[PDB]
Amino acid sequence: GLVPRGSHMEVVVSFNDLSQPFFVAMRRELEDEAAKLGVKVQVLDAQNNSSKQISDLQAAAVQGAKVVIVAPTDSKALAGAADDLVEQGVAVISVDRNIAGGKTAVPHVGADNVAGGRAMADWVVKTYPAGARVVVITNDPGSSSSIERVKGVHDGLAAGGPAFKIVTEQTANSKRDQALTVTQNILTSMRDTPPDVILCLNDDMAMGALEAVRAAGLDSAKVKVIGFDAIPEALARIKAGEMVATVEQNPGLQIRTALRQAVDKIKSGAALKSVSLKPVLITSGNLTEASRIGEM
Ligand SMILES: O[C@H]1[C@H](O)[C@@H](O)[C@H](O)[C@@H](O)[C@H]1O
């Protein structure tokens, strides 16, 4: 869906799946920053298809793109395309999740997702000092963000010990509809001993898990749901006392930082560099620390 370049002040931005609310919101911040920087952004949606994303990236290079910002559908699967683009003289920077396993080290702007996952688990260990039964519902399984969030959750619960039980860990592929049915089936499988905490690795899925908890006739005070992203819908649930926590990862700042680096690469050849942002756990006491609180 590319059009011809009119100047050098153009960047191609390839999103993994623009049907995800987190990324729709990220795209809005991208468009603001692009206007402010005087750069045209051409936005491509991979529609959760690695083959399409790879062909999109190849096409952008053929048509003259010199910097591409990519949120890869799968962090390992896009390594070949990134290497090819670099070899052709196209600079690549990743956003939100990384590209890994290739010849070239691709600079990456994202959240510290291990720290984010660890914050969720540390919350569980602090809140349940005698132990707890935990369900983990994971995001986009091929993404570094899922892999690293999961690792941080594992780290914190392993540190807590055998009293902190991961009763099941399943993906809902960053989809609210899958989150509902996946969570329902998990609840049914342990209806005689419901979990204490459902850790959901994005807020869209957390909304589905909250609904599954309600559909099961369970009490959101006894079966607690924690998300990730601090989207306004989740912030409202925390304000209402239905959801306990989420995690702020500053997606506006991620995308703005990637674009700022891209523009400096175009203007002066400045090197693209990795930046990891520290996430912050958001509860009812610090809702205003969420970057999108003004939308709630
Ligand atoms: O950081 C993002 C965010 O959490 C999205 O909501 C999720 O679906 C993606 O998988 C993740 O990489």
- For the chain, give every domain's residue range: 1-109+252-276, 110-251+277-295
Do 110-251+277-295 and 1-109+252-276 have the same topology in CATH? Answer: yes
Candidates 250, 247, 206; CA nearest to 119 is 247
For the four alpha carbons of 252, 70, 83 and 48, in that order, the dihedral sign comes to positive
Q: Which residue's CA is minimally distant from atom 1 of ligand 1? A: 96
Residue 245 is given by DSSP the state: B
CATH of 110-251+277-295 among 3.30.70.3460, 3.40.50.2300, 3.30.450.20, 3.30.420.40: 3.40.50.2300
Nearest CA to ligand 1 atom 11: 145
R_g of the chain, CA atoms, integer Å: 20
Pocket of ligand 1 (CB under 6 A): 20, 22, 96-97, 139-140, 143, 145-146, 174, 202, 204, 228-229
- Going by DSSP bridges, is the β-strand pair 10-15/40-45 parallel, antiparallel, or unpaired? parallel
Pick from 233, 240, 239, 213: nearest CA to 225? 213
Contacts of residue 259, Cβ cutoff 8 Å, sequence gap at least 6: 11, 13, 30, 33, 34, 37, 39, 41, 69
Resolution, expressed in angstroms to one decimal: 1.5
Report the nearest atom of ligand 1 relative to the CA of 144: 12
**Tokens coding 173:** 């592929």
| CATH topology (fold) of 1-109+252-276 | Rossmann fold (3.40.50)
> Rounded to whole angstroms, how far apart are CA atoms 180 and 172?
9
Mutate which of 109, 205, 228, 277 for ligand 1 pocket (most atoms within 8 A of beta carbon): 228
Q: Which of 20, 200, 282 to mutate to test the pocket of ligand 1 (most atoms within 8 A of CB)?
A: 20
Instruction: Find the 139 Cα to ligand 1 centroid distance in Å.
Output: 6
Burial class of residue 192 in the structure, from the number of CB atoms within 10 Å of its CB (0-12 exposed, 13-18 middle, 19+ buried): exposed
